[PDB]
Paper text:
Actin is the constituent protein of microfilaments with essential roles in central processes in the cell, including transport, cell division, and motility. Outliers of this functional consensus are actins of the phylum Apicomplexa, including Plasmodium spp. and Toxoplasma gondii—both notorious human pathogens. With less than 80% sequence identity to their canonical counterparts, actins of these parasites are among the most evolutionarily diverged eukaryotic actins while still retaining most of the core features.
These findings were corroborated by anomalous difference density maps, in which peaks of >4 σ were found for Pα, Pβ, and Pγ in Mg-ATP/ADP-PfActI but only for Pα and Pβ in the Mg-ADP-PfActI. In the Mg-ATP/ADP-PfActI, we found excess electron density, not explained by water, between the side chain of Asp155, the backbone nitrogen of Gly157, and the backbone carbonyl of Val160. Considering ions present, coordination distances, and geometry as well as anomalous scattering lengths at the used wavelength (1.032 Å), K+ is the most likely explanation for this density. We therefore modeled K+ at this site with a final refined occupancy of 0.7, which is close to the occupancy of ATP (0.8). The conformation of the corresponding Ser15 in PfActI moves from the ATP state through a double conformation with occupancies 0.8/0.2 in the ATP/ADP state to a complete ADP conformation. In the Mg-ATP/ADP structure, the backbone of the A loop has a second conformation (conformation 2a) with an occupancy of 0.4. In the Mg-ATP/ADP structure, Arg178 moves toward the carbonyl groups of His74 and Pro110 in conformation 1b, thus connecting the P loop in SD1 (residues 109–114) and H loop in SD2. The fortunate coincidence that our crystallization condition for both Plasmodium actins and the mutant forms contained K+ provided direct evidence of Mg2+-dependent K+ binding in the active site of PfActI.
Residue numbers in the entry:
A (entry chain A): 5 to 40, 52 to 366
B (entry chain G): 4 to 125
The structure:
Amino acid sequence: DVQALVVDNGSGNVKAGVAGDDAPRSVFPSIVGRPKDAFVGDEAQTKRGILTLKYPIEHGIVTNWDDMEKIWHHTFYNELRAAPEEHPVLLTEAPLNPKGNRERMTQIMFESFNVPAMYVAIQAVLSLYSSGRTTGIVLDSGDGVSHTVPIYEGYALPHAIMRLDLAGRDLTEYLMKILHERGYGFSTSAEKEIVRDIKEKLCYIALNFDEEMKTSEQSSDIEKSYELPDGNIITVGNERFRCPEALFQPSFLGKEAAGIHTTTFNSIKKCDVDIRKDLYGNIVLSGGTTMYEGIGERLTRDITTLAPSTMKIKVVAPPERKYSVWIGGSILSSLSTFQQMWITKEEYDES
Amino acid sequence: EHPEFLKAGKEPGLQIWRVEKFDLVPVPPNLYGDFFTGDAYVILKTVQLRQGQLQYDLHYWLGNECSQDESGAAAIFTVQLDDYLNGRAVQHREVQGFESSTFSGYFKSGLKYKKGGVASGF
Ligand SMILES: Nc1ncnc2c1ncn2[C@@H]1O[C@H](COP(=O)(O)OP(=O)(O)OP(=O)(O)O)[C@@H](O)[C@H]1O
Ligand SMILES: [Ca+2]
Ligand SMILES: [Ca+2]
Ligand SMILES: [Cl-]
Ligand SMILES: [K+]
Ligand SMILES: [Mg+2]
């Protein structure tokens, strides 16, 4: 008689809550502040003036285990008010996370937090399940990393996962950069949060970039306002679509990386010919950086161009895809079979 | 250990389960071929081959008004059943009104739909 906790370990935000909910009840920044013992999440940003702030998760991989343990403690004790030693826990991990990292997270859960049972899930796989599919390719673009993850009959294909060399934080930083054209000087950590919100509220993806540059220059209809915290209004023009264009043209960031269309194509090509149709027909978007208006239409055009013309390209953009990893975890950990999937503390300790 | 897994694929025939509150629940045989548009289902067709061996096709059927817990669970239970069957089942996603001819062909009266369904688990 017990309810699992579901924790999606994001580079930018942790999503946490209870199995069987349709959305995480706790979403907070993946930040730990220590004096210049430790503060986490929104409180750390509120006290940035007296704290040094660090991100324990880098491109989806935990790289500061002591600070990550502070994040998990905050999750259980200050967000959920749950005894970790009394609930099963489902924890997410990035595609291609090294087994040594999983083992270190498992050790912390079973020996620091004394969790009684746990299950580790690949983020992209959970998102596929949340879309009602067992086969497809997930493009999961978050704050710190983007992956393309082919999945066949329930399971990722490890040899075909690829990384697109940018994510939402790069897009925030690029908007900060290009707004200097208009005279804006956003640069501090606090200002970066403002610009992240501008990006989310005003950006969009052009269906055809060159044609959008030409139409936006013919009038002011591109321009939109945003009210800053101090009450001043900022106007943003073609930056609205030039910012997320970097997902398709990473050279805008000075990166040689392939864009997200090319990366998706390359990832499908790694898979044997006989399953590619099912992947092209089930391209599923997840994560906050896939939320731009226009993304599905643009991706469809660009992947259709690259792919063999016998293929049928269907890009799926679920409305609640910003939380689809967490939602998939909530579903999985609710199933009548979940109790058979986890590892118990007794098993681990005797292994 | 799930009781329905223990019954799955033991004889030639057709087995239909409905996702109900995060569980697989047998569909009453009288209802086979009628599907609630508000629900998701898992279907296992077992065929006896010439050699005597068994062939498995797993289909998960998604009603136009089913909730995300139901469609997600149907997909996951499909994977788990296939694993139970040692990966031998071919998996098929079936969307209301766009089902494969193979799936339609399991029902001599053809596929029919009904309003409503079991309540979401969410
Ligand atoms: N509506 C939106 N439009 C564009 N970007 C958005 C939107 N909403 C959120 N984002 C961006 O998505 C990112 C957060 O996404 P998400 O929560 O999926 O990442 P995460 O899981 O923390 O990171 P990762 O999976 O990369 O480790 C941030 O860069 C945020 O600004
Ligand atoms: Ca239902
Ligand atoms: Ca199989
Ligand atoms: Cl083409
Ligand atoms: K991601
Ligand atoms: Mg993520």
